């Protein structure tokens, strides 16, 4: 048995709509830059990322649903800004939609609500003092408007898949793959995802993995054929964020920061 | 939400009312929707499509299943998704695709015989699709001859397109199911394949029955056709969950005249001829002694004159009846 479309990525709406040049990336950013320095906007987005995965996880929802909930939340930001959609209104319906694509179905109207109110409220008290104020009616107009700027491209690919063949074929399953698989969960606090072929993210997993753990594999990822220079793009943004997350103190910060954020207009 | 985003984007939103003109030109009313044959009023397009109204409101598993699939999804002999509406009035939504003026059901109703070369050429191009589908992993799950649509005059004349309209019919089901295999598989839609290969060279539904998984007239029919399995011809047809009421309500001996080649031959198609050889390996009881879509293509039946055209018609009149409106 395999899932659907496993082997299609080179020819996927990821692949060639969903990789986004870097430069048009960081232009289109300059917008919420006007508001908020570089450091408090990647700072807002392992916010945001720290968010969904604690929603994925109340609702018990696997990992693979996670991602690709996150990847829509970044896809929407990325093109647009901070103020179009409140992203505390965009979180919860990126896991509602993430969850029909991936086969598990819909998320009732009761437990999606509890599921936000109750994280935000336990988990995430130190940035919101009120309570989530959106009903079922809200997350179903943001799903419309998500599904219009992603231009229904639902299937996203990965880094967790490939991450399995290497390590398979490494014959290191129970030595490198707990770590590696750790080091794929935090690549989505960064733009990676938005820029990298989901098997390069993997790559350059598998060598931070192997570097922490002294695990000589020079020859093994020498004998692939890759442009490297590019996996080194990756690896240097990979312990780059660790960099950053030591610096981080989320709770003692993100109040602050989540109050520079620009302001939806309201109607006249 | 932010005011200038909200209008900016209301603005520039393209319409299903505003770009096509449907209203009186309903072609089907699936159990998935409502399709109508669509006319481009803006300007440049003489061509025709197919608009689908997605059931119900909102991004029901149904409409989120189609979506993400079908804009992934590119073949020839596969149906393609030209655009998706998102009309936010009434939360409905609206698929695009390319119109098909035929299908298998209306142009086996109308020979009530075939040309052997569109035989041909029609089984080729829907193994081709399927084979597409099947390498991604796709299923279709309920292949027959109103879900193999077939396009009319224009740049994609007498081309397969392999589609699912949704709606009784168990004739194009492989007896596993019958017998209450839990999953679908790619045998399962080969099978099916089979049956409407079998339909293409005799226009009679080669397993039509009268009106639980289990049903005991559908497999009466396969076993008056094809005969009852001995053993070594499907081993594992012991593991299956109504083996049991198999073995209770059914005798083999019943079915000891009943053959394949019996059947085939009391309709005009010779037992030796590459098509009936083919037509063996596909509908095969076994589901895991039933070849693939790929070994299908490479069976020198493809090879014997005369080759599968492209155009399934090859240049010929299109004397079909085209679609009625609703
Ligand atoms: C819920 C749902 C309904 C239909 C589809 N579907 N699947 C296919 C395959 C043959 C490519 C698998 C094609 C379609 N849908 C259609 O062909 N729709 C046109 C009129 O309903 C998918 C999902």
Redesign the interface.
């Given at each position: 048995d395999?899932?659907?479309?496993?082997?299609?990525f080179w020819?996927?709406?990821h692949y060639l709509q969903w990789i986004l040049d870097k430069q048009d990336l960081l232009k289109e950013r300059q917008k919420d830059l006007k508001f908020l320095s570089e450091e408090e906007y990647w700072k807002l987005q392992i916010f945001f990322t720290n968010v969904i995965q604690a929603l994925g996880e109340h609702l018990k929802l696997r990992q693979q649903v996670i991602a690709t909930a996150t990847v829509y939340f970044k896809r929407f930001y990325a093109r647009?800004?901070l103020?179009?959609?409140?992203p505390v209104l965009m979180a919860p319906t990126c896991v509602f939609?993430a969850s029909?694509?991936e086969?598990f179905?819909?998320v009732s109207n009761t437990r999606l609500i509890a599921a936000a109110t109750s994280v935000l409220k336990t988990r995430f008290s130190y940035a919101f003092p009120k309570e989530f104020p959106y009903r079922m009616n809200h997350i179903?107009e943001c799903?419309?408007?998500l599904?219009?700027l992603m231009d229904?491209?639902?299937?996203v690919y990965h880094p967790y898949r490939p991450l399995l063949q290497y390590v398979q074929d490494m014959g290191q399953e129970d030595m490198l793959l707990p770590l590696a698989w750790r080091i794929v969960n935090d690549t989505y606090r960064t733009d990676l995802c938005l820029l990298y072929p989901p098997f390069m993210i993997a790559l350059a997993c598998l060598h931070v993995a192997c570097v922490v753990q002294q695990k000589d594999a020079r020859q093994w990822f020498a004998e692939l054929s890759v442009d490297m220079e590019k996996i080194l793009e990756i690896i240097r943004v990979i312990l780059k964020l660790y960099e950053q997350w030591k610096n981080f103190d989320e709770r003692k910060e993100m109040a602050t920061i989540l109050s520079k954020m620009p302001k939806?207009?309201?109607?006249? | 939400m932010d005011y200038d985003f909200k209008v900016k984007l209301s603005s520039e939103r393209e319409r299903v009312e505003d770009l096509f003109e449907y209203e009186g030109c309903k072609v089907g009313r699936g159990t998935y929707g409502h399709v109508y044959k669509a006319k481009r009023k803006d300007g440049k397009d003489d061509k025709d499509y197919a608009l689908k109204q997605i059931e119900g409101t909102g991004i029901s598993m149904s409409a989120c299943r189609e979506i993400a699939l079908l804009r992934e999804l590119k073949h020839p002999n596969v149906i393609s998704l030209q655009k998706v509406f998102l009309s936010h009035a009434d939360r409905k939504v609206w698929l695009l695709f390319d119109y098909a003026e035929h299908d298998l059901w209306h142009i086996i109703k109308f020979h009530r015989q075939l040309p052997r070369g569109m035989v041909k050429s029609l089984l080729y191009q829907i193994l081709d699709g399927i084979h597409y589908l099947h390498a991604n992993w796709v299923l279709h799950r309920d292949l027959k001859p109103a879900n193999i649509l077939v396009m009319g005059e224009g740049p994609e004349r007498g081309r397969v397109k392999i589609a699912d309209m949704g709606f009784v019919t168990f004739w194009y089901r492989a007896p596993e199911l019958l017998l209450g295999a839990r999953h679908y598989t790619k045998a399962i839609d080969i099978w099916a394949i089979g049956c409407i290969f079998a339909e293409l060279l005799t226009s009679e539904p080669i397993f039509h029955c009268r009106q639980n998984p289990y049903h005991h007239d559908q497999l009466d029919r396969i076993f008056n056709v094809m005969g009852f399995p001995a053993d070594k011809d499907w081993e594992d047809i012991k593991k299956m969950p109504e083996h049991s009421t198999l073995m209770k309500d059914f005798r083999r001996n019943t079915y000891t005249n009943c053959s394949l080649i019996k059947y085939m031959e009391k309709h005009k198609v010779k037992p030796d001829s590459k098509a009936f050889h083919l037509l063996q390996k596909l509908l095969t009881m076994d589901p895991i002694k039933r070849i693939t879509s790929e070994q299908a293509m490479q069976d020198p039946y493809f090879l014997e004159d005369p080759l599968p055209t492209s155009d399934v018609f090859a240049g010929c009149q299109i004397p079909y009846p085209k679609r009625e409106f609703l």
């Open positions: 395999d899932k659907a479309m496993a082997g299609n020819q996927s709406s647009y800004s103020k179009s959609i409140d939609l029909k694509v086969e179905g819909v179903l799903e419309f408007y599904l219009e229904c491209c639902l299937i939806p207009k309201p109607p006249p | -």
